[PDB]
Amino acid sequence: GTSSMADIGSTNDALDYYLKSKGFNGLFSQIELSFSASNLRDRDVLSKSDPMVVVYQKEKDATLSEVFRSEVVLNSLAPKWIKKFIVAYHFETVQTLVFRVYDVDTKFQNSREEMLKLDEQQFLGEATCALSEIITKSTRTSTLELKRKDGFAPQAQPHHGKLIIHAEESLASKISTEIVFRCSNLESKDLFSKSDPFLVVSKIVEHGTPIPVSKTEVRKNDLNPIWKPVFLSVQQVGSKDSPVIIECSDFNSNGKHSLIGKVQKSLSDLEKLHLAGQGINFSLPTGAGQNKVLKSQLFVDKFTETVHHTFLEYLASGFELNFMVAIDFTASNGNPRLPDSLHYIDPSGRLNAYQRAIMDVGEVLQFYDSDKRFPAWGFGARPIDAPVSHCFNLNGSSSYSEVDGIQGIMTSYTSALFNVSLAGPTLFGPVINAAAMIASASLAQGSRKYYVLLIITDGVITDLQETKDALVSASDLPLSILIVGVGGADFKEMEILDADKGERLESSSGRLASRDIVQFVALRDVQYGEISVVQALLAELPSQFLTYMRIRN
Numbered sequence: 111g112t113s114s115m116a117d118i119g120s121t122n123d124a125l126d127y128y129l130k131s132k133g134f135n136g137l138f139s140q141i142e143l144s145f146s147a148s149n150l151r152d153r154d155v156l157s158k159s160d161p162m163v164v165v166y167q168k169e170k171d172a173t174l175s176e177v178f179r180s181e182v183v184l185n186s187l188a189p190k191w192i193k194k195f196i197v198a199y200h201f202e203t204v205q206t207l208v209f210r211v212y213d214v215d216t217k218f219q220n221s222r223e224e225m226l227k228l229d230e231q232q233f234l235g236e237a238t239c240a241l242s243e244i245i246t247k248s249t250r251t252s253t254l255e256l257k258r259k260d261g262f263a264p265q266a267q268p269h270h271g272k273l274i275i276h277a278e279e280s281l282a283s284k285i286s287t288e289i290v291f292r293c294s295n296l297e298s299k300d301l302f303s304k305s306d307p308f309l310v311v312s313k314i315v316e317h318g319t320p321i322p323v324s325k326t327e328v329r330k331n332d333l334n335p336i337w338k339p340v341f342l343s344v345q346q347v348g349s350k351d352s353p354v355i356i357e358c359s360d361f362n363s364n365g366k367h368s369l370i371g372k373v374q375k376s377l378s379d380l381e382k383l384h385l386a387g388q389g390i391n392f393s394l395p396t397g398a399g400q401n402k403v404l405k406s407q408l409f410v411d412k413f414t415e416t417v418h419h420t421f422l423e424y425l426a427s428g429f430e431l432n433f434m435v436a437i438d439f440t441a442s443n444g445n446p447r448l449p450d451s452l453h454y455i456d457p458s459g460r461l462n463a464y465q466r467a468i469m470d471v472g473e474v475l476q477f478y479d480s481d482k483r484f485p486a487w488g489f490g491a492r493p494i495d496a497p498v499s500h501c502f503n504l505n506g507s508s509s510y511s512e513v514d515g516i517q518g519i520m521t522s523y524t525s526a527l528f529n530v531s532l533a534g535p536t537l538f539g540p541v542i543n544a545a546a547m548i549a550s551a552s553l554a555q556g557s558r559k560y561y562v563l564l565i566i567t568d569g570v571i572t573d574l575q576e577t578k579d580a581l582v583s584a585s586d587l588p589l590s591i592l593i594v595g596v597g598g599a600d601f602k603e604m605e606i607l608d609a610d611k612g613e614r615l616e617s618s619s620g621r622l623a624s625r626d627i628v629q630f631v632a633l634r635d636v637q638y639g640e641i642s643v644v645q646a647l648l649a650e651l652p653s654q655f656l657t658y659m660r661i662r663n
Contacts, residue, residue, distance in 0.1 A: 111298065111306040113363035115330065118306065121361070122327045127614065131626055133656050134418045136323075136343040140283040141245060141422075143195040143275055145180055147211060148188045150234055150256075150271035159213040161189040162223060162231070163273065168206040168238065170639070177207075179223055182214045196280060197241065201421065202648035204474055205241035209273055211256055233258070235270035242477040244277040246425055251276045279422045287377060288339045290412035291326065291356075294389060295405055296333050298360045299368040304331045306361040307370060311340065311354055313347060314374075320355050323347065328361040336411060342377065350377045356408065358392060369394065371404050384410035421652035424659065427558075431478035431655070433471070434548075434563040435519055436541040437464060437504065439491035441532040442569045443597075452568050452597050453527055463596035463635045465520065467566045470644040471592065472516040475562055485511035485548060486519050487541050491530040498533040501540040502526075511544070536569050539576040542584060542591070549587040560588040560655050568597040570604065575618055581607070582615050585623040586662075590654045592647050595632040604630045609650070625657045 145163050149156060165178035177197070183189035199205070213232040235256025244252045256270040291309055298305040308328045312320035323346045326337040347354055354377065358370040371392025375383075383390060389407035396402045444451035454462055461469065476482060486504040493499060503511045504522035506529065513522050545563040552559045571577055581591070595601040605611040609626035616622055629647050637643065 111300065111303070111360040111362045111368070113306060113361060117363035118328050118330055118361065125325065125327060130657055130660065131609075131653070133653050133660070134286050134341050134343070135653075136346040137283060137286065137418060137420060138345055139199040139201075139420060139422055140280040141197055141199045141241065142278045142280050143178075143197065143244070144278075145191040145195075145276075146189060146274045147256075148272050148274070149269070150189075150211065150213065152213065152232055152234055152270065154268075156187065158185050158187055159232075159234075160184050160216060160219065161186060161234075162212050162214050162226070163191060164210045164212065164228065165195055166208040166210070168208050174208060181223055182218075182221075182226075184219060199241060199245070199279075199422070201242075201652050202474065202645045204477070206238065207241060208236060208238045209254065209275070210236050211271065211273060235273075237273055240477060241277075242474075244275055245279075245422060246477055246480075248426075248428070250278065250426065279420060281417065282344075284417045284420050284423075285415050286341045286343045286418050288341055288412065288414045288416060289380065289410060290337065290339050292334070292336045292409040292411045293358060294334055294407035294409065296335070296358060296370050297404065297406060298370060300360065304333060305370060306330055307332060307335050307358055308361055308367075309337060309340075310357045310359060311342065312357070313354060314352070323354070339412065347377055352376060353379075358406075358408070371406050371408075373408055380410050381413050384413040419656075419659075421656060424655070425478070429558045429560065430480060431475055431651070432484070432559045432561050433475040433479060434485045434487075434545055434561055435468060435472075435504075436487040436489060436501075436545070436563060436565045437523060437526075438536065438565075438567040438569070439488040439526070439530060439532055440534050440536050440569065441490075442534070442536070442599075443532055445532065446527045453532075455524055455527065463633055464523070464566050466635075466637075466639070467564065467594045467596065467633055467644065468519055468523070469516070470639075470642060471562075471564050471648065472519065474648055476516050482515045483512040484515070484519055485545070486513045486522050487511055487544060488526050488530065489538075489541050490533055490536055491526075492533045493530050500537045501544045502530070535572040536567060537573045537577075538565060538567075538571050539573045539580055541565065542577065542580040545589055545591075546580065546584045546587055549584070549589040553588060560590070560658065562590045562592065562651060564592045564594065566594045566596060568595070569599050570601065574603070577607070578615050579617050579619070581628055582617040582621055582623045585615075585625055585627050588658055588662075589627060590651055591628045592644075593628065593630040594644070594647075595630065596635055601630070601632050604632075624661055625654070627654060 160182050162182045163180045166174040167177045178195040180191040181193050211234045237254035252275045254273045296305045309326045311324040313323050314320050324340045329335045353374050357372045360368040360370050389409045392404045392406045393401040443453050446453040488502050488504050489500045504526045505513050549561045607628045608630040631643050
């Protein structure tokens with residue numbers, strides 16, 4: 111193809127970076143819950159029973175859907191249920207589950223569990239927790255006390271047994287396939303010139319364009335290329351027996367790449383080829399409907415299914431995510447005592463935009479920290495008698511920023527609101543350096559903490575440059591940053607910071623960001639807790655965490 115060494119070098123650099131960011135992209139995680147119980151009792155007597163556990167998904171409106179039902183264990187004082195509950199793990203949401211244990215009537219000893227009516231059985235007890243509560247325990251086991259509504263009695267409330275829940279990440283959901291592709295005698299469509307080839311693997315759609323799933327670097331002047339390994343998860347392809355498209359293409363710096371050849375094979379087919387050591391011939395499309403077999407061949411030099419080191423694997427090795435907050439206290443918000451202030455504290459208890467953001471993020475992240483000691487800052491306000499502070503402790507102390515839990519953040523926030531003067535201008539630099547300073551200390555002390563700083567703002571920043579510089583410096587530290595914009599301001603200048611919408615950050619000194627650590631979204635505050643545009647922001651955090659873990663040195 112037609113291109114300089116520099117064009118090739120740079121397209122490859124762009125690809126390396128994108129691969130580090132996506133990661134071993136596309137393992138959606140599944141968790142196996144297994145169940146046992148002890149001391150099951152309707153009243154004060156422990157006797158043989160026929161226990162069954164039923165699991166409900168609790169919605170935000172408190173509605174319950176049945177999602178699982180164990181087999182009935184017969185004649186038992188301590189059931190160990192055989193059937194496991196496989197549930198999808200979504201890091202970005204709190205997954206509330208309700209567990210109900212029943213003693214099945216003996217007249218249904220020979221029944222399938224699916225056919226049992228719960229009203230016809232003896233309800234023993236109920237317990238509730240989040241999925242994230244179980245997977246973050248060091249033993250991955252939770253013991254929950256079964257309770258009933260007896261009337262009313264928080265203290266004198268009898269126990270009806272213990273439910274023991276063990277969680278394990280399913281092995282199948284951790285697998286990715288490493289493939290080294292090789293080609294033989296490639297012919298570029300451009301005559302009298304050697305090919306500059308790359309591969310693209312695509313998942314097939316019916317009657318519309320196939321979705322790029324994987325891509326190799328470009329090799330310069332290679333008729334018989336051996337590419338670096340590409341990685342593919344089962345979700346990226348569909349199944350191991352689903353055919354994918356593999357296209358060999360000639361790289362042109364003008365961005366219009368010519369097809370060298372194409373094959374259609376399943377991941378299973380590729381494994382067979384690899385073990386046999388056999389090549390397959392490429393094809394080009396010819397006359398609307400027919401293909402032409404080429405001399406050129408595709409080989410599979412390596413094909414290895416590996417258990418990837420997943421987010422859940424790191425949690426199990428004692429890594430934590432530690433939430434941080436930084437709140438805009440500039441005058442642009444309006445005086446907190448005004449009903450139309452973005453910081454208005456409604457007497458009825460309704461949460462303002464800042465409070466909604468804190469809860470939407472913190473309600474999820476709280477489960478990943480054992481200490482629950484969250485640094486909390488304000489910026490752009492004048493404390494009593496002092497000059498404007500661009501990083502002050504919400505808790506009002508001079509020596510430490512940490513507060514106790516989400517509640518601690520919420521109370522420090524309302525407390526700060528009526529103890530400072532909203533000022534100006536808007537700066538992110540100082541708070542980012544404060545978070546960086548903590549992350550850096552954690553790194554040097556060989557701690558296993560990864561920080562997530564939520565910055566909430568209602569306007570554009572003044573110190574765009576020193577912000578970029580601070581983000582770049584921070585990109586080597588165990589820190590992710592979420593930026594939420596509240597109110598109706600125009601946040602166009604914010605998007606240059608976003609991982610998705612923006613571009614790789616460059617320092618003023620010329621240095622580039624090791625990885626993307628920043629996401630921005632505008633809370634377009636019409637939302638009552640429905641679409642929850644924050645969720646998407648949380649979804650990217652495990653990737654960022656894993657990227658940090660791969661890069662770090």
